[PDB]
From a paper:
AlgW, a membrane-bound periplasmic serine protease belonging to the HtrA protein family, is a key regulator of the regulated intramembrane proteolysis (RIP) pathway and is responsible for transmitting the envelope stress signals in Pseudomonas aeruginosa. The AlgW PDZ domain senses and binds the C-terminal of mis-localized outer membrane proteins (OMPs) or periplasmic protein MucE, leading to catalytic activation of the protease domain. HtrA protease is characterized by its trypsin-like catalytic domain and regulatory PDZ domain; the catalytic triad was surrounded by several loops (L1, L2, L3, LD, LA) but, usually, in an inactive mode, and could be activated by sensing a specific molecular stimulus. The catalytic triad (H123, D153, and S227) sites are located between two β-barrels and are surrounded by activation loops L1 to L3, LD, and LA (named according to DegS nomenclature).
In order to elucidate the structural basis of the AlgW reaction mechanism, we prepared the periplasmic soluble domain of AlgW and its inactive mutant AlgWS227A. Protein samples were mixed with two types of peptide activator (tripeptide WVF, decapeptide SVRDELRWVF) prior to crystallization trials, yielding four complex structures, AlgW-tripeptide, AlgWS227A-tripeptide, AlgW-decapeptide, and AlgWS227A-decapeptide, with resolutions from 1.8 to 2.6 Å. AlgWS227A-decapeptide could even generate a DegQ-like “cage” architecture after symmetry operation; the dodecamer of soluble AlgW contains four trimers, with the 12 LA loops protruding toward the interior of the cage. LA-mediated higher oligomerization is an important regulation mechanism in the HtrA family; however, very few close contacts are observed between trimers in AlgW-decapeptide and AlgWS227A-decapeptide structures, indicating that crystal packing may, in fact, dominate the above-described intertrimer associations. Fortunately, LA loops could be reliably modeled in AlgW-decapeptide and AlgWS227A-decapeptide structures, allowing us to explore the conformational regulation mode of the LA loop. By comparing the two sets of decapeptide-bound structures, we found that the LA loop shows joint angle shifts of about 7.65 degrees. It seems that the LA loop in the AlgWS227A-decapeptide structure represents the major state of LA, because similar to the LA loops in tripeptide-bound structures, they all need to stabilize the antiparallel β1-β4 sheet by forming main-chain hydrogen between D129-Q130 and T72 and maintain the orientation of β1 through the weak interaction between T71 and V124. Consistently, AlgW-peptide bound structures also demonstrated different interdomain orientations, in which the joint angles of the PDZ relative to the protease domain are AlgW-WVF (25.62°) < AlgWS227A-WVF (25.74°) < AlgW-decapeptide (25.47 to 26.48°; average, 26.13°) < AlgWS227A-decapeptide (26.65°).
Residue numbers in the entry:
A (entry chain D), B (entry chain D), C (entry chain D): 53 to 381
D (entry chain C), E (entry chain C), F (entry chain C): 4 to 10
Write the structure that this text describes.
Amino acid sequence: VSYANAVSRAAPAVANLYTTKMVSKPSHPLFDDPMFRRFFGDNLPQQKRMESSLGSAVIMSAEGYLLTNNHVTAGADQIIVALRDGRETIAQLVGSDPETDLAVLKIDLKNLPAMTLGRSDGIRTGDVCLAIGNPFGVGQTVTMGIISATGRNQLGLNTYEDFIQTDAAINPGNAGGALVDAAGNLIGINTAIFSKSGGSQGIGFAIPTKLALEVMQSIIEHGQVIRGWLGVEVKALTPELAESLGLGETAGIVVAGVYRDGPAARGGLLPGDVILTIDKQEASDGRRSMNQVARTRPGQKISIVVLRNGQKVNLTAEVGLRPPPAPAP
Amino acid sequence: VSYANAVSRAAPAVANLYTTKMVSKPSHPLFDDPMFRRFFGDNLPQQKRMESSLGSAVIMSAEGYLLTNNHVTAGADQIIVALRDGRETIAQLVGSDPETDLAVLKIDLKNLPAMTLGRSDGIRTGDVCLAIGNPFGVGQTVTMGIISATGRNQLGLNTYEDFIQTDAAINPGNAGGALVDAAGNLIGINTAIFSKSGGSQGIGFAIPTKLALEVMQSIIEHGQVIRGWLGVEVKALTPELAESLGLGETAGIVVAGVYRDGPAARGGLLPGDVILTIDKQEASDGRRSMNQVARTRPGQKISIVVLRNGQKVNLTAEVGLRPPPAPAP
Amino acid sequence: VSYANAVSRAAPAVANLYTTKMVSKPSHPLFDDPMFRRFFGDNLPQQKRMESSLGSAVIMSAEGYLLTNNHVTAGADQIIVALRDGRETIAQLVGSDPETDLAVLKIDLKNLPAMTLGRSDGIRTGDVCLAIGNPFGVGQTVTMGIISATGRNQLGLNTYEDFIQTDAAINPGNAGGALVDAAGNLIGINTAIFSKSGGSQGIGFAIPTKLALEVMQSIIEHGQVIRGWLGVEVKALTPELAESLGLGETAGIVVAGVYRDGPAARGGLLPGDVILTIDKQEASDGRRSMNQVARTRPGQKISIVVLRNGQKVNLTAEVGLRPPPAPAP
Amino acid sequence: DELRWVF
Amino acid sequence: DELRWVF
Amino acid sequence: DELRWVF
């Protein structure tokens, strides 16, 4: 069989990213603690221009919005977009979302191809898929495998995860590019690999379209991703403390820590309490409730029920805006 | 096209293995010869609990028998089996066979899915196949390639070999899992890779079903694999010694060594003789005859013809039980 | 689906290569500058017999011509060819072409299978393809992926490049073997990988049939590849020097250097001139014109127009034979 | 063990 | 060379 | 930059 028609449909909508960045940190034998004390003067941190360079990006719409990974563009001073046809432009960064490793770009160009979107929820483990990006800077290349698994969360790459896992060969330089189904429709943004060698060993991960679209639409509208904030640190419940409360494995979440000055604080959430229901929804898994607070919009008064002094107490908080992560990519 | 229906048929019958083992050997800078002489006392070997952990296993029958690799469970103190549905049990080891790198497990559970068995002898190089296991502990993942070759013996992994070779991505954590054909039927137990990097480079090996079933059925019946024992060490024949005997390249096998006290010894097999026929079958390849003795059952009187003092002599031995390999996995 | 019929059609025409070579250079801790001055005498360079060994080769015709990579056989003292059926012969080297990394072999044997040739120009990115060779010396193995891209030049592997890029697993030992399409017809000679680990990461390159045939036919006829020689070193033109001439981005090629005694020299080509047209063809890309001179036959008078002293001048050269590359593989 | 989610 | 099988 | 082709 052949997938050249899928390649023809989607490939023109996948672009190459070249990013440059000025940096104050060099090769690590030099410029360390030893430099300034290895019989040598302080002198000056010489800031080199390093090239994140190889990446990829998907042309989401004809108006010139590009999707990609945050870790490719974070910190860039310049982003060059190179189209399959050979056109080049410098892009501007509409906005980023480090917690899902996604970025939105804009270019001013017309006669721009756009990716047909598939439906992430409709993929099944076993479906053939194709990966399109710029491995090792060799040029746009297409690789082929199958959906290995779906909804991989708990990888620990980013704080909000719903990864597709693909067999197809994904290498450094594929980040940002398209994961596409046999028809040629976008089902993911290729993001991460698990390797022992720095190159593809057949364990690759893409962000599914459903999550990507939702992030991109919020960035275009508000320049940001809007997420609910409660301000609480929470840890799981075990049988061992299931008993101590006297009422056991109701899916409890333990309020280990409450952000000082937060909306949960401001609503009288207290350290050492126990959360039974968030917004009339039972709070069992820390992930579960953390994602439910993320989707709850800021400005929404919600009810929270907590087992505190051994008796249910009913509180109310006003969900706030979630603050950015700041330093890391 | 898509292989999601095959994945749906077989995936539920592939499980994840987590094994723990207590060990007396630690990281090798410490506890070596230097420890006890590096200005330090003998103290005590501290035995750490190490996790062979990631492996996989195939649910051979509804009654709860699991197949897997010996090297995953050898030496384990505890084996946890985790089912695709999320159920968990501790398994017991029915019995192992280091010489084919296979182990049989038993769990007590019902409503258990079972793998439909394909026919190993019917696969042809070129057929698509799927690999199911737990690479890197990421979760059950399905990978896809083609049968690259068949009947790979002489790899030197184990003493009895008949390996299928597959393109599909096999990594640490896939050992024990299923190799499956496009329909979704078991054709192998994934066992070994050849890599320069510790991860899949597309050279993977699975034990074919035909051999696996035969090993598993013998383990369930007798707790052991029953193999013929002759007690002889044998080396090949070359033209150079073809002449010295005066009768050349009759496929001879040279009796380099005879186990002392063995059934070949007890039948008057002698070092430096020459074996022309084992059990009225001509003995050409050392592998050939070693596999023929393995399949001959213990307790079977057989005839052996040897060129000793330059004239054929007819001996008779009673095939014995083959003794285990003991130390290595 | 299955590709076993393609494998059956082409696999018998792919052979294994084992080459041995005597070498004067050993392991590099020893025999270096330190050896002869590390309190030790000069003694003698001991020349070891090293085995390029694993490679592959395609049986181009029933008369016994084999195609393969130059880097597998270059320098070999003996080349053993091992056929899929198990036959073995020693081959002779008809001739090599280091600049495309191709070699032609001859064996004297009959009842020889031959590879059906596909059409390199007809492949499209997305087509399934199969790779046949001897990875790691494990035996003939078939691997499967898709055409990832086409006409990869500028990789820098060899001076004349037109590489197919394939997903399918290519490892050390695959060089020389067949890249084949879903029908089973030769579309390339597998040649190179880009890896971070020395093993397949899904970035592999094959020489396309069209180029391979053309090289092989010239070798069989003349023992050599016949290429046009101009004897010039040429560097690109930028806007910055586009202006200085006064006439800009006409695709110019700058004659940085003229071989002394060459046909361009002999025709009055001069350093610092500017080439506008080679053989009534405009000379824009250095690659473009270098390939056009390569295809122009030696002995052909051609016209060259150069912007020298700010005014077009018309010269004539007689294309010569291109001299070999000599040392490197 | 103890792992902490934050929202 | 010399390689040894054992049964 | 400066890259050189030779024919």
